[PDB]
Amino acid sequence: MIKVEIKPSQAQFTTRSGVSRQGKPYSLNEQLCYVDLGNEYPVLVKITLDEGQPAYAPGLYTVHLSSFHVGQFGSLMIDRLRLVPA
Amino acid sequence: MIKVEIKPSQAQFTTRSGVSRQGKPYSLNEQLCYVDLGNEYPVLVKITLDEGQPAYAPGLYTVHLSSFHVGQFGSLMIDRLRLVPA
Numbered sequence: 001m002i003k004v005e006i007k008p009s010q011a012q013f014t015t016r017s018g019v020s021r022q023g024k025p026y027s028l029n030e031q032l033c034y035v036d037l038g039n040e041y042p043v044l045v046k047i048t049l050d051e052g053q054p055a056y057a058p059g060l061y062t063v064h065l066s067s068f069h070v071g072q073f074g075s076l077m078i079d080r081l082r083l084v085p086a
Numbered sequence: 087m088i089k090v091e092i093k094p095s096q097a098q099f100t101t102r103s104g105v106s107r108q109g110k111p112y113s114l115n116e117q118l119c120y121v122d123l124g125n126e127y128p129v130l131v132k133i134t135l136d137e138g139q140p141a142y143a144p145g146l147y148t149v150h151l152s153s154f155h156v157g158q159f160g161s162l163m164i165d166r167l168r169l170v171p172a
Binding site: 001002035036037038043044045046047048062063065066068069070073074075076077078080081 | 087088121122123124148149151156159160161163164166
């Protein structure tokens with residue numbers, strides 16, 4: 001139901017890095033995508049992938065249920081967008 | 087795709103009230119519901135409805151696209167859960 005599109009230009013990902021307070025480094029992969037929210041065009045969205053998750057190939061995806069969780073105030077929140085092919 | 091269930095016990099809603107800093111009062115309706123996230127059972131979630139939105143009747147619902155928006159850091163966030171009957 002939520003249609004997410006990774007265009008050919010968006011196979012191109014980036015990696016952000018640093019070290020934590022507690023002496024330990026990190027790297028997160030980041031990729032852009034288009035999410036169709038029923039507006040005139042799809043919106044540009046940024047995804048930050050989980051540790052050691054490969055970037056997504058071009059194609060149509062949908063949002064996997066594991067993207068969601070119950071937040072701090074009892075309401076449903078997005079943890080991070082986890083996609084599965086359509 | 088996200089299945090939300092309002093049980094007969096959850097027709098029972100509540101209203102929270104107060105006045106704002108800038109001299110103006112408010113009231114938000116709040117209702118509970120069950121969201122199926124593929125785990126062993128559905129999770130209990132709290133919904134806070136929009137201004138002047140009536141509470142939901144019992145039944146099966148799904149999440150409407152207008153629940154989502156692009157947040158402050160460029161990622162997709164839930165604004166508040168807006169439901170439509172299944």
